[PDB]
Amino acid sequence: DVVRPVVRKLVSEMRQNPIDVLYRPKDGARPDAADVLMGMYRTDMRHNTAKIAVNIAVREQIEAGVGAWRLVTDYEDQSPTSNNQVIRREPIHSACSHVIWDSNSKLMDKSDARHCTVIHSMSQNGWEDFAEKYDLDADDIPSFQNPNDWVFPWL
């Protein structure tokens, strides 16, 4: 290898300068209007999952050139952020093939995209867990387009 040290250096450099959202009030807004939402954002996006997702996206952007996240809503009965609910940022691995953005979107943030498809690859036990979580029939095994290939002879 002569390229891998470069990738490691770039990943380390990008990790030494963490970035997060910083909400600020409007021009005519109150001088303290943005504090509560900013505090709740710090509350939700302080666990390990958010940092790991950001790091995965950064590494894929360095290597593959594309990365993605996903914000989902969940109910937390003990220590909730607000309204007995919390927001977490779980990672998406191989966002190039596991995230299918709209082909008509002409923006980097994909805000023009009017639809998006996310392909989930899970083991069998993961399939029963998914079916139980979303109230699905675990007996009917699903099928979809294979995002990944079998070029490497995986067992």
């Binding site: 490691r8 250096k9 990943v11 380390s12 990790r15 302080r46 390990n48 940092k51 003990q78 220590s79």
Partner: protein
Amino acid sequence: VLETYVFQDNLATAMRRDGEIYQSIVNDIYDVPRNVTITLEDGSEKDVQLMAEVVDLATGEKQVLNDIRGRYECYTDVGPSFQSMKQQNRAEILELLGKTPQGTPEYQLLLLQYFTLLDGKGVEMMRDYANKQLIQMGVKKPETPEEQQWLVEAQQAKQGQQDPAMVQAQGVLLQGQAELAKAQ
């Protein structure tokens, strides 16, 4: 390229997971006291901590804790490793000293560092001296009655004995010329 930075941040995330698991285990087996700072009587007793702990002794055998859902009041973070809380506080005071110029807060921080100094009686003299200085300044709250005696001595020494010089001389002039008024 430190080179071990990404390997350092991965270890930091591992430490955060360890802290989360430890917090869960503590809330499940350990006894976690709850601070119930109260102001009983007609505003007396001020704001003082009580560190209330609730335990139940089963008639059959053993005891099982009592912890409320207000347990996740602390969020895990990453910091330097310390052997005990005293070392952590000492490091805090040293960092603050490095972050403070040589003013009155510098003396305050130096005395507070002397407060949390090591066990040997070789520095017991300076531990007692720092305690006395902080208490006489009134910043510290005396717990043992000898510290209250030191505070009382400081109050007596400051009030009356340390009369301002020029202010009192000019008050002398005030009295004298008021007498000139009385005598016309």
